[PDB]
């Protein structure tokens, strides 16, 4: 019984199995300075850990029981892996689609090479014969943590690039700053972790919900963050930083309210609620502008993938009208609509980026409701996060000719409850999204071919206003995580959610192979 999330595009049965021994040979293209056996070298290690299976090299075709060819035709993620009694033969142009195939191999084995655990006694291994060709639907397939609302560390995030990884998502969006929270070292501002990564209570207050008195935090040094994108580069992820300005910012504004402030001569503390705060980053501050550049200058050193995330969220204006430099900003740019200043700082930080060399740009991205403002001086070179009315914003930015990403709070919110059970842990919803309900979103549903180009691809996204504990998160991540994979990956024609809900019962013993919590509702 084959089990393969996300389905591939073609998948054909053939008689027999291929078996491997203990050691076997392995012909590898060198394509590209050897990149591709290096990519079959971390497989080579995987596959000896969860199996005892040593491969070796050939350079003889006829030698070879595993050869990975080289075909140029194919696209950047796509493969072919044919499997038979005499040899495992895969194709790929490109070392991602050489890596996908490595995954699609592993996931036609037990269960537990994928986890890439060890059984205690004696196995023998093989292969269903099978044909596969296979490529994503999407190119971006995604996945968002919110660890300024609570810090889960180097560990779990590790944890969570790997569950990411089996299900072939390529985006990790690293929501890295909040409220209630400042997650990465900055060199040049220290106390954007000494002061923002930590506070007085590990709860968020929400209603009857009050502090709870602990004191709570943690944060990235630039070392962690090197060693993570690393990580994450080895299984083909790429890793998004976002970092919010000028709302979502008060443990900015706690660290340094000397200029971060709007009401410097006040008190200001990191958030202990949950909500929208007003106590936003004073755009109209020269030192503020500095900041906000020396920070990016910063990104652009952690993270080579080309894009940064600011935001463009509709941060509560009050303190800004309340703000002499800020009033004075919004009459020197001819307005009376205090949204205008938030728009003229991304302005002023998209045109800083574009005065630096080539290889240290990066395109930004922002939230769709930043489309509610006068945006026309920000140009169509920015990328949509579409999250709310995401259908419609989606088809609005591909109208504009920008990029646009499906985030869509209902159904991909998966921090959101997935039963309505009594039993469930807290978090945001009623317990409507259920893996069915992720599972049968439709991104394309009633769009033009025409703007079709401009969707970029899927993500969830999860917020952890509710959300403290790593076993907590992983059970709401778990399985739904793969319904959106899945959702990225497989052509449409191929997808069926009574059809994943029968594959995605075989990962159970992943999870617990890997020691992953999960929602157990469609298991079993
Ligand atoms: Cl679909
Ligand atoms: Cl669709």
């Known amino acids: 019984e ?39 070298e971390s497989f ?34 796509a493969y072919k892996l044919n499997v038979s009694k005499k040899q495992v033969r895969i194709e790929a142009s490109r070392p991602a689609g050489f890596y996908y195939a490595l995954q699609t191999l592993k996931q036609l084995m037990p269960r537990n090479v994928m986890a890439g655990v060890a059984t205690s006694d004696h196995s023998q291994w093989s292969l269903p014969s099978v044909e596969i060709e296979d490529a994503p639907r999407f190119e971006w397939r995604g996945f968002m943590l919110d660890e300024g609302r609570h810090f889960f560390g180097k560990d ?32 040049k501002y220290p106390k954007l972790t000494e002061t923002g990564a930590w506070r007085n209570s590990k709860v968020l207050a929400y209603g009857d919900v009050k502090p709870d008195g602990e004191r709570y935090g943690g944060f990235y040094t630039q070392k962690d963050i090197k060693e993570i994108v690393a990580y994450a580069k080895k299984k083909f992820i790429e890793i998004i930083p976002e970092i919010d300005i000028p709302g979502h910012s008060q443990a900015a504004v706690a660290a340094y309210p000397e200029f971060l402030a709007c009401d410097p001569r006040d008190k200001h503390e990191v958030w202990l609620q949950q909500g929208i ?24 050193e952690l993270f080579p993938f080309n894009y940064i995330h600011l935001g463009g969220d509709e941060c509560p204006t009050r303190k800004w009208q309340k703000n002499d430099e800020c009033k004075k900003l919004l009459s020197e740019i001819g307005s009376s609509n205090f949204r ?19 290889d240290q740009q990066r395109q930004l991205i922002f939230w769709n ?156």
């Not at 009633?446 to 993500?459: E, I």
Request: charged share 25%; hydrophobic share 40%.
């Open 2 to 40: 084959i089990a393969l999330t996300p389905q591939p595009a073609h998948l054909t049965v053939k008689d027999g199995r291929f078996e491997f021994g203990n050691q076997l040979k392995a012909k590898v293209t060198p394509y590209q300075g050897d990149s591709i056996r290096m990519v079959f």
């Open 156 to 187: 779990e995030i590790k944890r969570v690039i790997d569950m990411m990884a089996i299900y072939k998502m390529n985006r990790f969006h690293w929501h890295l700053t909040e409220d209630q929270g400042w997650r990465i070292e900055i060199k």
């Open 44 to 77: 080579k290690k995987e596959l000896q850990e969860a199996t005892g299976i040593k491969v070796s090299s050939t350079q003889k075709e006829a030698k070879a029981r595993i050869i990975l060819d080289l075909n140029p035709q194919l696209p950047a993620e």
């Open 340 to 358: 205008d200043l938030q728009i003229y700082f991304y302005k002023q930080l998209k045109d800083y980026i574009a005065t630096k060399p080539a």
């Open 369 to 524: 409701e930043v489309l509610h403002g006068n945006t026309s001086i920000l140009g169509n070179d920015i990328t949509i996060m579409a999250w709310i009315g995401a259908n419609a914003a989606a088809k609005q930015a591909a109208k504009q000719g920008m990029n646009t990403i499906l985030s869509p709070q209902i159904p991909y919110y998966i921090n959101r409850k997935q039963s309505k059970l009594p039993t469930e842990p807290m978090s945001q919803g009623h317990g409507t999204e259920t893996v069915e309900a992720v599972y049968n979103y439709q991104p394309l549903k009633d769009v033009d071919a025409a703007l079709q180009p401009y969707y970029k691809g899927v993500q969830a996204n999860f917020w952890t206003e509710w959300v403290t504990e790593p076993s907590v998160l992983e059970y709401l991540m778990l399985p739904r995580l793969a319904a959106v994979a899945e959702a990225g990956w497989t052509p449409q024609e191929k997808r069926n959610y009574e059809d994943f809900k029968e594959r995605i019962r075989k990962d159970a013993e992943l999870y617990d192979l890997k020691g992953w919590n999960y929602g157990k509702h469609i298991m079993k």
């Open 277 to 300: 705060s007003t106590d936003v980053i004073n755009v109209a501050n020269p030192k503020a502008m500095q900041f906000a550049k020396e920070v990016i200058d910063e990104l652009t």
